[PDB]
Structures are given as structure tokens and as C-alpha cells.
From Swiss-Prot, chain A:
This is Large ribosomal subunit protein eL28. The keyword NADP does not apply. Component of the large ribosomal subunit (LSU). Mature yeast ribosomes consist of a small (40S) and a large (60S) subunit. The 40S small subunit contains 1 molecule of ribosomal RNA (18S rRNA) and at least 33 different proteins. The large 60S subunit contains 3 rRNA molecules (25S, 5.8S and 5S rRNA) and at least 46 different proteins. The lineage of its organism: Eukaryota, Fungi, Dikarya, Ascomycota, Taphrinomycotina. InterPro entries: Ribosomal_eL28, Ribosomal_eL28/Mak16. Keywords: Cytoplasm, Phosphoprotein, Ribonucleoprotein, Ribosomal protein. It comes from Schizosaccharomyces pombe (strain 972 / ATCC 24843). The modification Phosphoserine is found at S60.
From Swiss-Prot, chain C:
It holds the Pfam family Ribosomal_L32e. Disulfide bonds: none annotated. PANTHER family: 60S RIBOSOMAL PROTEIN L32 AND DNA-DIRECTED RNA POLYMERASE II, SUBUNIT N, RIBOSOMAL PROTEIN L32. Belongs to the eukaryotic ribosomal protein eL32 family. Component of the large ribosomal subunit (LSU). Mature yeast ribosomes consist of a small (40S) and a large (60S) subunit. The 40S small subunit contains 1 molecule of ribosomal RNA (18S rRNA) and at least 33 different proteins. The large 60S subunit contains 3 rRNA molecules (25S, 5.8S and 5S rRNA) and at least 46 different proteins. It comes from the Eukaryota. GO terms for cellular component: cytosol; cytosolic large ribosomal subunit; nucleus; preribosome. The modification Phosphoserine is found at S75. This is Large ribosomal subunit protein eL32A. CDD domains: Ribosomal_L32_L32e. GO terms for molecular function: structural constituent of ribosome.
Curated annotation (Swiss-Prot), chain D:
It is found in: Cytoplasm. Belongs to the eukaryotic ribosomal protein eL18 family. This is Large ribosomal subunit protein eL18B. Its main location: cytoplasm. The modification Phosphoserine is found at S135. Component of the large ribosomal subunit (LSU). Mature yeast ribosomes consist of a small (40S) and a large (60S) subunit. The 40S small subunit contains 1 molecule of ribosomal RNA (18S rRNA) and at least 33 different proteins. The large 60S subunit contains 3 rRNA molecules (25S, 5.8S and 5S rRNA) and at least 46 different proteins. eL18 interacts with NAP1.
Swiss-Prot record, chain E:
GO terms for cellular component: cytosol; cytosolic large ribosomal subunit; nucleolus; nucleus; preribosome. The keyword Cytoplasm applies. Component of the ribosome, a large ribonucleoprotein complex responsible for the synthesis of proteins in the cell. The small ribosomal subunit (SSU) binds messenger RNAs (mRNAs) and translates the encoded message by selecting cognate aminoacyl-transfer RNA (tRNA) molecules. The large subunit (LSU) contains the ribosomal catalytic site termed the peptidyl transferase center (PTC), which catalyzes the formation of peptide bonds, thereby polymerizing the amino acids delivered by tRNAs into a polypeptide chain. This is Large ribosomal subunit protein uL24. Gene3D superfamilies: 2.30.30.30. PROSITE patterns: RIBOSOMAL_L24. Component of the large ribosomal subunit (LSU). Mature yeast ribosomes consist of a small (40S) and a large (60S) subunit. The 40S small subunit contains 1 molecule of ribosomal RNA (18S rRNA) and at least 33 different proteins. The large 60S subunit contains 3 rRNA molecules (25S, 5.8S and 5S rRNA) and at least 46 different proteins. It comes from the Eukaryota. GO terms for biological process: cytoplasmic translation; ribosomal large subunit biogenesis. Belongs to the universal ribosomal protein uL24 family. It is found in: Cytoplasm; Nucleus; Nucleus, Nucleolus. The gene is rpl26.
Amino acid sequence: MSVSNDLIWQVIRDNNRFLVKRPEFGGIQFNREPVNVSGKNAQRFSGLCNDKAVGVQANSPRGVVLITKTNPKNAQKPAKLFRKDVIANASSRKTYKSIAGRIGRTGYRDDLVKVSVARASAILSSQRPKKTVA
Amino acid sequence: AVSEKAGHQTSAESWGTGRALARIPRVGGGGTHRSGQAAFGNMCRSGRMFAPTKTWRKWHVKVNQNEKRYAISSAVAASGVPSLLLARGHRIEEIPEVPLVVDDAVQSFQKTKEAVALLKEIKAYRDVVKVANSRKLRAGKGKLRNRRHVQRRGPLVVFNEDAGIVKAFRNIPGVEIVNVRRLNLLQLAPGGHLGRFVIWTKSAFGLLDSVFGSTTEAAQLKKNYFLPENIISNADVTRLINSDEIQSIVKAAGPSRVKR
Amino acid sequence: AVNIIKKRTKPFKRHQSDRFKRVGESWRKPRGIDSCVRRRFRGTISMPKIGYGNNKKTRYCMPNGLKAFLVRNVSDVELLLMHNKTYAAEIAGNVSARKRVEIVEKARALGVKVTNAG
Amino acid sequence: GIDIERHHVRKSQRSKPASENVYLKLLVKLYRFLARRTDSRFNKAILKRLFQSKTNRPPISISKIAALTSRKSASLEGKTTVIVGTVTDDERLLTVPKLSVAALRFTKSARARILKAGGEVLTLDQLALRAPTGSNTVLLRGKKHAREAYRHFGFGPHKHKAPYVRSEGRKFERARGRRKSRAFKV
Amino acid sequence: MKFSRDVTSSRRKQRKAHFGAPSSVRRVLMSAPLSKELREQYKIRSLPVRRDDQITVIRGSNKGREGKITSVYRKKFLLLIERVTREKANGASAPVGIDASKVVITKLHLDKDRKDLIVRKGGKV
Amino acid sequence: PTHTSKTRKLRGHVSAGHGRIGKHRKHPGGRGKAGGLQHLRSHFDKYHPGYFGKVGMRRFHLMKNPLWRPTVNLDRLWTLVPNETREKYLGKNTEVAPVINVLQSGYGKVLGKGRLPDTPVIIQTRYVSRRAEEKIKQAGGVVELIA
Amino acid sequence: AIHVKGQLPNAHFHKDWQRYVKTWFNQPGRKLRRRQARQTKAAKIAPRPVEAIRPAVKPPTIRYNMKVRAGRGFTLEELKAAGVSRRVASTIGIPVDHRRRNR
RNA sequence: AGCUAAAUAUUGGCGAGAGACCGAUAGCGAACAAGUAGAGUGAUCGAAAGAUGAAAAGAACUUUGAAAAGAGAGUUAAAUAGUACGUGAAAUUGCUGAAAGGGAAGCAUUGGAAAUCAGUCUUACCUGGGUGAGAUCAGUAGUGCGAGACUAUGCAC
RNA sequence: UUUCAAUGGCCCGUCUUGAAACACGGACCAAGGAGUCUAGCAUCUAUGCGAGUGUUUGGGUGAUGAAAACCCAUCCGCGAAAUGAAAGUGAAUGCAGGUGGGAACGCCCUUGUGGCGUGCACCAUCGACCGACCCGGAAUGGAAGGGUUUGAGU
RNA sequence: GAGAAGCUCAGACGAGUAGGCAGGCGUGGAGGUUUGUGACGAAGCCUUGGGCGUGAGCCUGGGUCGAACAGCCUCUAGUG
RNA sequence: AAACUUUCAGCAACGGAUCUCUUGGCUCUCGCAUCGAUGAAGAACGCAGCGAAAUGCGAUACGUAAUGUGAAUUG
């Protein structure tokens, strides 16, 4: 059993919880779902559609957490569908290598490696301490 | 509808030309503010509105029974897709399985505490928390017309036998309980949006086959009813396009982008 | 976002709105049978036309090359984490002082420019 | 100033189906790719007919399909029949031949009779998989002018068309203007 | 959720009934909860207020103020309490009204009718 | 609905689509369909010929129940029997022939159109056309009249 | 005037028809009231059957003579053949129709 | 010659439950002492008019004035809520400030003068150079059968 | 943003061939203010089913709480047969016919605006069948033979 | 990858009353959704400040204010 | 150079728009059937400690008897 990912995208392309669309700037759209890394509303980036999807989130108090969709046999098991790897407090290079290895070198999603690394870098730069100027 | 006599309960006639006044009818007599004022016009204060609303306006809309069953079947099928539930906003990230079926002992529940405990154990209580947090006062004048509060929709419990499950689950905010034999589209696709979180009982899930039947078999509880046939056998167009049967016969891929 | 050129900076005021106070400044197309603005006689006011449209690349862009994305809470600022170089954050006018401070601190952490900051 | 007459400027063809069916859009997407990446006019014809309206896609019957593929000089013995539309049943045909039919949708009775007779029913995506270019395929259409509106279209003097009548019988447009005994006959 | 046919959830009707209730109904409307000791003794949660009832204010600016109910202004839905006043410009002490639900009774004015009401509610003696 | 109506787009246009010369006055050619012989004759004679006049006899107090006689053709006679009856008799060789009661199916007369299988069949009907009876006899069946 | 396609108009609305417009907003209420009324009658006349036994008759005319429907009451000859008096048939719930005859 | 329940109607009266209706020029004419005030001999005609404040706590007292009131005060979270009272637009008006003006003014294009606003530029990844300190890195070893990825234990100091 | 200078700029709406008009309305401002609803019809489009189609006239789950949603039977409406005023009659010679153009497909020639074979839809046309009319027409019946015709037919 | 409702390249063209069509802006109410805004100040109003859109309009800074209000997908109308 | 006129802005006026509410209206549904010569509907005149309009009442007059609640009415 498998409901088509193309069918799911057609249903949720314009109406779903994680889409933030606004008529400003000619109708911009943003995707906020946890298992999407690009941040834009597209079928190739929608993790609710793609069987194999990746996502990067901030981790408390530091580091990032990589969310990946497991084997499609867990499609009807949402509790077993998502695997979360909390990257420890490692250097930026170590984090990039770990993400690149777990995403691209394993054949999972070779096209999302650059996006995942960039998002991880942005999260780390956001988590860095603030040198307040008084 | 407005009153039939609204705007007509005055005695007024037009004064004609030569009085340096608009030819709209005016109230006769004297000794009061209403005297000499215009009436009977949609542009006049305390007059008659343009095209007064009638009660015999068509309020109800008829739908073919086959179309209604098609919509209900699509809503039930959509409820079994985990991505659609997340799309509709149901917090079902940590629930064990979609569709979610519980034991028939739930139908014999007697307390809201038991119902809440079951929801927390099957990880469905996050929807209840979402509904409780989302409860807010309505924006606009609907709060003056017995519609003060608005909130989100929670899980839809479907049962076969009522032994206390309805009373146990009814007080939980956002939770709607319905019998399997009378599934409602307004609850299965609230707001016209598919992907409602539904919790079935064992008996209700087992009776779903007899309620809807199949494409080739007739439904036991719906006479001469068959499930609709789809116009596409496999809706994975990307797989069909990238399959060997097509890629082996297509011409040169061509340039996806051409330099200026 | 680079070399932004405005074809016109005038707001296309409505005809005779200066003459009469009941006539609003919002543009309305003159449809009179003897209207001179509609016929575009020399010396009259200009009418909005599709030819005045700005370049698609530079359209909707602030003079700094960014686009003012409205933010009402912290989550709206997190929406701009990846689009740091194209979208700036405009805090909604109905946001309280506490939430405004939180939004500013989150945008500063994310490196997102804020238009109505301070 | 340039003196150019603008007569055939805007094309009067659909570039997208009016229907909002998601599965129909999926079929359109598949055959958009097929028409672009193949040099077969069959794929272009299917894509064009996918955009057409309900009136422009008349239904066809299994009797009509059987009659068209069982002509003496036909040689359409085992070829697959493709129609972009609904295939209806004809109860007047007591015995159904073995037919391979591909269509948008099938009537329940027609599909059951085809399967019982030993034939096969395919969707358009299945037809695309089996015959990516439409080889050995009999492409058919329903009768476009078989609807009620074409009985009245073109009504006028000496046109022999059906008038729009509230009822049927005498006292209903069967008088002066319709026979010689009453002034004139049309 | 209300299910009875004789119960109205209309805001208009509910407000009309509350603001138009007669004195007998307003007596029941102006009810105050009993103290923890009173609840554990009489097995009653709340009771309609009465004159010479010992109460302490729970909410409002006059928190912690104990005293007896000087008068029960049922027309204004207010309780006038002893020594709970505010000074005026001329020096007169204008009493300050407190809602019956904003105070808790610490000692009841127990008469024969009050005792009957307690037993009717299900209270012990 | 109202939001997709032409009135919402006609807002701001003075004449509301009815023109500045002819306007949208009250009935300028009369009410209803009056004038079909004098000033609407050009429309009546070209689009509704035969409207004016008398043709035929009058029948006082016509009742359609005695005139009730729906018709069915030969190529649908075998569709009136159940599927099991068709599998038992159609195309087979049995000592008895199936009986098709057209009146019970809801028809008054049997008309001759289309073809019939060579298997014999008994047709019960109030009326039957000559061609229908001939084709049924050719197929081997018989027609017995009922009331 | 008439200048568009289609059949000529035939609207019968030249009277004050808006005064006598009948709405069906009370249809579910009427259905509930009738259901409650027959439930009340069933409880009142229990254990007697809610509906009396009716004879089987052939509807008149050639359009409906091939069907069988329910009649009003049994004829006197039918009651005599069944050994039931007409004065006792009503008591035991058997309707009597003096107009109908057995041809 | 005659009687007869039910299914049927119900813009009147009484009671009740509701609304994808109107939110004070709307909705009944009437949300308020409304068929009231008021007009006509009469038949009849027939309005306008809701909101301080949580609580009057509705401004004690002093001073000026014949008084009305003003100024100090006082109450209040608020008197930018004082009963002429929720907020408080426009038309219109007074004071102050700026500018212009030889029988109209208003507008459009361009620039001048005056006034006002925008930049945080050079941030950020990365690296050259100095020192401090650090549980320490490449290749590895053990802990899913080939290739590859990641985590963990140790070596590599 | 204000103002100055240069240049240009007639008061809007309306009827009208023609308005700046010595043609009409407009002293100012706020609020209100005019293609709506219903019974039909016609074209087009979408949806479901399809020689069928329409559950809501009605009945039941129904008491709980049910103006909703869900289920259910017999009539009936429209369509499946037309023609004639009517009595009446009532649609296959054939592969449900032939001819021309004709989508798609298949086979060749070699690059052609190429030939061969069927041929969906649609149009034009020659026929065949049903009803009406005009015939001959070998008490009642009009079976075969026809026709310069006629029908909103097959 | 670029909302395949997408991306990319190239050419030609652009007056308009009556009138036709399409795509959009704005208003009241309804369903769905946004751990949506808000007494640490919602709506409204004023503004000699700022920004976006050809435009209908929208966002924002400052002042007043005191209780509700909004974005997106649909439904609807006593909607400019 | 003032005064005067015009525009804008800040305060102060005139006015009551906008916004938010609403014991009101309108509409629908459900249930019921009860005026009068034993004097109806309606009209007039009076009744309270301070009461003119409204509600209530009738010289037993914002009312008596009886019944129920149980400490108020309130300026």
C-alpha cells in the first residue's frame, strides 16, 4: 500500500498547515515543516510528500539535530517514520562532514547536501554568543 | 428576512415639481420632525431597503447521493494518509499508526479521566492540548449572536456500539464522537479540507468494509453501491515518466537552459 | 536588488482631488464623456498605465535591495533564517513592547535586518 | 504607426483542462512529457483531448467499439482501442466480444461485461506504459453532434431544425408558418 | 454542553434574566462560598449571603479586610461591609460595595431558617 | 455567488453595461410576448413558426390512462429477463422457451427494431407490430396476446 | 421584448403570488411531530397492531390493472365467506367496505 | 333531511428554543417614561432621543467675582473621563509657527533655495601575525559477511 | 514637504454630430444611497452516474440532544420512438449501406507539399427503413408495387 | 530544485466612447488553519515621518485611545 | 515693515462620524387554546411619607385574604 506522493503534493500544494503564503512581492510562499530543509514550498523539498526527506533544526542549548525519514515501510507508522540525530557540540567542520556523510554519501539525498550544510551553518551562527556593544 | 411592512408603514406622496424639492415622496402633515421628510426610497432615512430579503430564498442545496458518498469515501481515505493529517494541522507526529484503531473496551469507558488517559497513552492528547490553547474569542459581531468562542478541531472518535464512550469523550474540547454507520462529511473534512485525525474502534473499523463495500463488491449497508473507480491506475507520474519503458523510447533530452 | 531604478515616484493623484475635499486622493479612472484627463490632453495629469511597471528583478525591493517581510511573532522571524540576503523583517505595529524586543533579539541572532527597529 | 491587421492573434485552444481533478492533472502532466519527448502525433492528440470539455468528449459504447474494430476490411483484431472519455454499455449487444479498451473511465456495467467476456480495461497511464507512442492503437471518438442542442442549432426558415417548444403536440407551433393550410409553410 | 430543551444558552436571554431578576431570585444570585472550616463542618460549599454574616474579602483592592455584612444591596448586587469605606472630599465615609462572589463567609448568622436551609442542602448539625 | 457576479465589476461604470443612448428604461417593446403578430413578427416567424392559429380537433375531458401504451423494441426483449434466465436459455437448446411478459416489464406494445437471436422465446404483450411478429416467428418464437 | 433563444415564456405570475408563497421550513418539524404522534398512538393502542389489516385489490384502468395494492376494507361477501360478522369485524380490527363488491 | 375525530391552515394571543440576520440615519415608527411629544375641526399624520467612571470616589477647603464662574487645590489608572461626560473624523472656527500674494486660486514637467529622512557600510565565512591555554587531529586498532557513511571505545600526545 | 522661475494646463458629471459654454445638476462635510431574490428558458463550463438518471412527497435509526448527517420502499418526472387533426400505424437488402474530404495508426519509397491500406469525429452527397400525403390498388383488411413529395424521424 | 500553477530563450505589437471578457484591490458575516496579535495596550482616529505596488490599496514610525482583532484556503452578501 | 487673504502643522473650539458593545428589533421552529350581560376590549377619574410619566391597583385603591421563600426597600 502506498498513496502517491504526487497526489499528496497536489492536495497540499496550496493548503496545508506548514505553508505561510502572502500576497506581498507577487505571492511569496514559505514552508515551515520540520522535515524540510530548503524552506521553500516545492514538491522536491516537501518532506510530507518525499519518502526520503531531510531537515535541520536548532538544538538546545547548542548544536543541531538532523531529522531524516526512515524506510518507507514506516509510512503508516508516524512514530517510527522520523529519525532524529542530535549532533553533539562539535566544530563546524565536523558538523558539516557528519551531515554530508549522512545525507549525500549514503545515497539518501545527494541534492540536499548543500542546503543542509548551509542551514546548519546558519543555525550555528545564530547560536553563537552576542558580543554586545555598549 | 426584514419585515414585510418595514418602510411601508408611513403615509407619504410625492409633491411634484415646482416646489424646488426632489420628487421623492414626502411625509405630509406638520408639527413634527417627520413632517416633510422623504420616505419609501432606498436612499431615504427610515425608508425601505432595496430588494428586501425574502424568506423563500433558496437556503438548502441538493447533492446527488452518489456524489455525497464519493466525498465521504474520499474523506475517509484521506484520513488514512499521515501527511494529510499533518497538513490539516493535527498533532499526530508521535501517534503509533495511521489509521489508529483502539480496542473495543474503549466503547465501555465511563469517565472523562479514562478517555484522557487513553488519549495520552496513544499520544493523541496533543491535539486536545492544541485545541485548548487555540480557544479564543471570536473576531467580529458573531460574538453578539451566540458565537463568542472559536477553537480548532481535535480527533474524531468513531464507534460501533455506545456503552459510555460518547459521554466519556464528549466533554473533551475538540473531540467529536460519531457512529460508524452515519459518518458526516462536515466532520470528516471540516472546512472543506481533507485529512481529519480519526480514531477508530475495532468494531467500527471492521464494519467499514460493510459500510462502504468495494469497487467490485456491493456495500452491505448501502444498497447497490460500489466504490468509485479512479481515472488513473497508478498516480506516481514521476515513476511512470522516469521508468525504463518511457525513457528507452524518448528522444534526446535537449537543453534545460539555453545560453543567450 | 542591484541598480534599482524607479520609473516614477509620483503617487498618481486623482483628478480634482485637490479642488474638492469630498474627492479622495486614491486614483479613479475618469469616465466622463468630455473628460480631458481620459483623452490625455497636453498639460493634464497622467494616468496609471502598464508601461510604468518597474523591472521584475528590482520590483518590490527596498532601496537597500531587501523586501520587507511582515513579522508578528518570533516564528515569523525564524521563517527568514535561510533568506537572510533577500528579506528584511518588518515588525507589525500591533506587536507589544515585550514581543518586539524578543523579535529584535531573534532577528539580530539570525542576522536578519529589521526596518522598524528602535 | 504600423498598418497591421489583427485577425488571427489569440489562439482559441485550451492550454490546460478546465477541470480541477488532481488525477486528471497528473494524466495531463504525464502526456505533456510524452508529447514533448516523443515525435508521435498520437501523444499530442491524447494531450489535446485531455483538455477538452465534457461536450467535446462524447461517450462511446462497447457496441460501437466492437463494430468499428470488427469491420471486414479492418484488420483490427487484437489492437487496443483508446478513447479519451467514458465508455458506456449497450445492453442491446447480448454477447460482448473480447476487447482491449483504454479510456478515461468505464461504466460499471460496461467494465463488468468486458471483463466477463475476457477483455481488458486500461487507464490512460496504463496505455502510456504499454504503448508509449500509440503503436497498433485504434484511436476513437464519440459522436460530437449527438447531443440535444444540435437538434436546435441553426434553426430558421427552411432549415428543418427542432424548435424550442414548451410541450409537444397540436396547439404547439403547428399552425400558421408550418403548413400551407395556414398562410404558409415556413 | 447543555442538552435540555428548557435551558437557554442565549446571551441576550441570560443577561436579561440576570439584570431583571426580582429580589427573591437575586438573593440566590448573590451567593458566597463558605470557608474551609465551614465547608468541612456543614458539608456545604456555598450559601446565599445575609446581613450580620462574618466575611473576609478575597479579591479586589480591599484584600484581607474582615467584617460583618452591614447591608445587602440586592438592587446593585453589592455587599456593604463594616469599616470598609472610603473617605470623601468633605470627610464622610462612603461605604464601598463588594460582590458576593468576592468574599468568603467565616461565620454564619445561624437562625431557624438558616438551619433548615443547611439541612435542606444536606448539611449536618 | 454575488462575489463573482458581473455587477461587482460594473461598479464605477455609470451606465452599468446598458448604454448611454438606449439606457435601461422599463419595458420598451411591451410586456411578456405581446406583439408577436405586429412588431415581433420578424422574431416569431423565424424562430417560432406555427405559433398563431388553430390545427386539429378538440377532445373534451381527455384521460391518458386508457391511452397509456409505452413501446419496446425487439433488440431489448432479452434485456427484460434476469441474467440467470439469459444464461439458461439464450443460445442453448431446451425443451421449453423463456416467457417474457412485456406488460409486467412496463410496456404496452412490442415494436420491431433490431435483430433477435435464433433461440425461441415467448412474448406476451397487449399489442405487437406486424414486423415485430414476423421477426419473432423467424427467430422461432411466438406472440400470445394478453390483457 | 422576446429576442433571445429558447421557448417562449409562460410564467403564471400576474397575480399577487407573493402573498401566498408556501415555504417548507417546518418539514423536519412536521416529520418529527408525525413520528411522535404515531409513537404515542402505538403506545396507547398496544398490544393492538398500529395498522389494520387491508384487502388486496386490483387498481382500475389498463395502466394499473396489472398491479396489486391495498384496499379500504373487506366486502360483506368476503366476511360472510370467512365467517366473520360485520358487527364484530370492526371490534377485532377488520375494516368493512360496503361499497366494494366481489365481481 | 342530519352528525362526525385524525392527517390540513395559523403575519392574532400566550409560552419556549434558536439564527452564516441589523449593531442606534441600521433593525419594528418606537433598544430611551413611543403610538409618547407634537400637528390637524375631523378622518388621521407622527417623530427626535443609547454609552462618564470599577466604584460618585460627582471636585472638601482657600482666594477673586454681585452672580454665573475662574485660579489654586482634591478624587481617579485616566479629568487628553467633570455629568455640554466611552473614543472623538470631516465641513467650519480662534491662537501660535512657517511660507506666499500687482484684477483668481488650484495642477503637471524640470530645477534652485529652505526644512526633513536614509545609510552602521569597512558587517559575516575564511585566512596572514602574537601569546596564552586545552579533556586533542590525519592514518589507524578493537566493538553488521564485501564497498561506503555515521556514533561510540581507545591509539596516535 | 513648502515656495520661486520657465513651459503647458478652460469646470466636473449628463443628453448630444458637436459643451468651457450665455444648456442642465452641483455652497461645504459626515453617514446612507441604486441590476437583488424567486418561477422558468437558452448557451457554455465543472461534478456524479450513465440507457438510465433523480435518497429529501414520505418512512427509520430517534430517546438520549438530533431543522444536520446517515439509511430505506412504492409511484412518478425526464430520457430510451416517431409520425398524423384523428382513427391508427410504427424504423436492418447489405459490415446498420455507397461516394469525397478527413484524426490517429500500420507498410513501403527515399525526402518528398511522397505513395499503399483501413479508416474515429464532422460536413456535403447517392440510397435504404418508419409515419403522413398523393397513387395505381392486384362487407371487412391494405398484404405486395410505387411517387415529382412531406416529418422537430431510424 | 526554483509553487512543471515552475524554469529558460526569441520575435512582433501597445489610441480608444457604447459594449464584451480576464486577472486582481477593498468591506460585513461563516467553516478550516496560523503553541496568530492584544490591557507591558486590540479596534478606531490624527500626523508638518519612512517603505512597497503602474494602480485599486498595503505595511510601518510618532501622538490619542482603552477591549477586542488579524494573516492564509474556501463559503457567503443589504460589499466600494 | 505691518495689517489682510490663502495653504499646512501643533493646541484650543463647533459638530457627532468612526470603532467596540446592546435587558432591542427582524426571521425561523416548537408547544397551547383561555374574552364578554356572573358585565369584555377600550375610555375617564383617583390610590404611595416625599410620585408628574411608566407598571400595579380601585375608596379594602403601588392594594386585603391565603400560600411559598426567608431580613429586607432603598434616593
